[PDB]
Amino acid sequence: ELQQNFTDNNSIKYTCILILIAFAFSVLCRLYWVAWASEFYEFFFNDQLMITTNDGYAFAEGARDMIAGFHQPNDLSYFGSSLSTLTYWLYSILPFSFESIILYMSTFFASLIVVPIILIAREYKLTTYGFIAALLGSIANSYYNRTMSGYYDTDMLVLVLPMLILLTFIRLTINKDIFTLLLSPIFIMIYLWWYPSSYSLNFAMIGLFGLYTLVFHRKEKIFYLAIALMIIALSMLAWQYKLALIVLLFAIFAFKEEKINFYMIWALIFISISILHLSGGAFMYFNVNETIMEVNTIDPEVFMQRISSSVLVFILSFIGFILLCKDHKSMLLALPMLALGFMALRAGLRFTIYAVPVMALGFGYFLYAFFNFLEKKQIKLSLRNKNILLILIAFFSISPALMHIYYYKSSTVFTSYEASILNDLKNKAQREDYVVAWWDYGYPIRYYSDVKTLIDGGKHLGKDNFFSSFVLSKEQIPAANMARLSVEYTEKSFKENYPDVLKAMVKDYNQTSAKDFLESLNDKNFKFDTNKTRDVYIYMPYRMLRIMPVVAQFANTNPDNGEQEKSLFFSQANAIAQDGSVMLDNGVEIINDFRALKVEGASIPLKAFVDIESITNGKFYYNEIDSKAQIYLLFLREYKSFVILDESLYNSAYIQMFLLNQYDQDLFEQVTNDTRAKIYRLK
C-alpha cells in the first residue's frame, strides 16, 4: 500500500488511475455546493437547481430554441452557439432534463483539465507530481469560481482546450510522433469553434511554437509542417478545406517517408499565411467597463489567491514554474497562458483563470525539485516517509481551495420567485414583444419569457444601456416615452442599420441637439411619426435597488457631451444599532428622531422621511421635514432596509412605480405586482 515507489511509475494503467481519481475528485468538489443549495427552496425551478451566471441564460435560451427548431427574427438568440450546440447534443443523447444538464455540464467538462495536467506532467517523466498539480489546478479559486456546478457559461473548456493544445506541442517536441500533427490543428480548431475569442491566444501560442521551432529545432522536418497546419487551422476556411487540406498534408508526410525540402515547406508557410491574409489576421455615452463585476480589479493578495488559493503556494508555484522551464524549455511554450493570467492585474479579474493550470504544474515540479535537494544533497529518506511527506505537503496546499469552496455559496442568478414571475410573463406576452429592463437581467428575462429585450450582457455598451437607463431613472412620463421610441427604433436599427440609434431618433424628430430631444419626452401629449408594432413592458424587481446609482449614471451622462448631468446621491443599507442614534453600514447615521444623517461627520437635513409599509398596495407615510432640503430617507419595512435618495432618484420611474406603487394610469398598466418585482406595460 504505502511502501511502493510511485514517483518513478509512468505507466498507462497508473496514469489512467491517477486521471480517474483526479477527475472524480475534481467532480466531487464542484458538487458540495449542490449538497448545500438544495435545502433552500428559493434556488429551484422546474424541480431542479438553477444556473449561476447571467451569461448562462444566453446559451440556455439559445439551446432551448435549438431544441425547438427555430429562434425568432432579429431577437438576439445564441441559437447555434458552441455551448448551445453541445447542450442540445447531450440533451438529445441523455435522459436528464434540460435544467439538470445545463446545471452539471460545467461540473463535468471543466473537470477534464485534470487530464492534460497529469499527461504533460508525464511527458516530463513526472506523473505522480502531475496528479498533485491537477488536484490543485482543478480547485484553485478562480477556476472553481468560473466552473462551479452552477456556471453554465463558455468557461467550462476555456482552459481545457489550450492546455490540451500545449501537451500536444510538447509531445511533438519530445516524441516527434506524427499523431501530434493531426491533434494540434484539430484542438486549435475546436478551441476556435467553441470560443471565438481564443483567437489571439492561439495566434500567440503558434507564434511562440514557431520562434521556438526556429531556435531549438531549425532543422527538424515535422515541425515546419506543424507550424503550417496550425496556421491553416487558425485562418477562416470552410471546415471542409481545413479537415481535408490537413489530412492530405498528413498522409503525404506519413507515407512519403522523407521527401520534402525546406523551400516547399516555406512555401506552404507563406501560402498558408496568405490564406490568413485573405481571411483576416459626435454622440458619446458613459462607459460600461468601470461597471462590470467580472472585470473589476485586484489587490495582488487576491491575485495570488485566485490563481493558487494561497500566497505562499503562489510563491512556491512561480519558482516551480521557473525551474520547470529552465529545466525543460517546452514548458516555455506555456508562457502566453501565464501572461494572460497576469494580464488580469490591469485587464480584469476574470483573467487569473488562464494562469491556474500552468502555475499548477509549476507547483508540482517544485515538489519534485525539492524532494531532489534531499535525495541529492544526501538525505536518506525511505519510501514510507517520502510518501507521507508528499501526501501531507499536498493536502496542506489544497485545503485552502477546499475551504474557499465551502465558503463560496452563490445564490442563483435569480430566485424562483423572479423566474416564475417571468414565466408567468411568457403566457401574457407575445414572442415579438419588447421588455425594457436593465442589461444584467436581459438574458434571464429572455430565457424565462421568450420575449425580446433591449439590452443584454452581450449587447450592453453605453449607447445601448442609455435607453433602458433612461426609461428606469428619468421621470415617469418621459420614461414611458423612451420605452416606446427605444423599442421601436431598436427594431428599426435591424433594417436601416443605425450606427447610433439615439442620433437616429434625433435626426428623425428635427431636434438640433439631444437635450432638446430628451427634455421633450416630458410633455405627455407626444407626436408619434413612428408606428406602434408590438407591446412594450418594463420589469422592476427589488434586486435592482443596489444598482440604481450605477444604472442611473448612464442616462445621467448627456449623450451630447459626455458630461454627467446631475449630482446623484443614493445609498441602500441596513441598521446595526439604536439608542436614537442609528448606525448604517456605509458610516452614515440617523440622528435626532429620523431628521438628519451623519454622513462622514456631516449632519444633514432630511427633506423628508418616507415610511413604506406595503409595496404591493402603495401604503406609505410621507413625513415632511426641512421643506428646503434635498435628501430623502426611505424605509422598506418588508425588507427591513434603509434607502437614501436625492429628489430626482426619489422621482425616477423605478422608485416611483415600484417602491411607492404610483403610476400614471393612462400610460401604463401594472401587469404584475409582487414585493419582489413589478411589471408594467405601455398603452
Binding site: D55, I292, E294, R546, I547
Partner: peptide, 8 residues
C-alpha cells in the same frame, strides 16, 4: 464577483 453583472 466573477459574474457578468453590474456593480456598484
Amino acid at each position: 464577483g466573477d459574474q457578468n453583472a453590474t456593480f456598484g
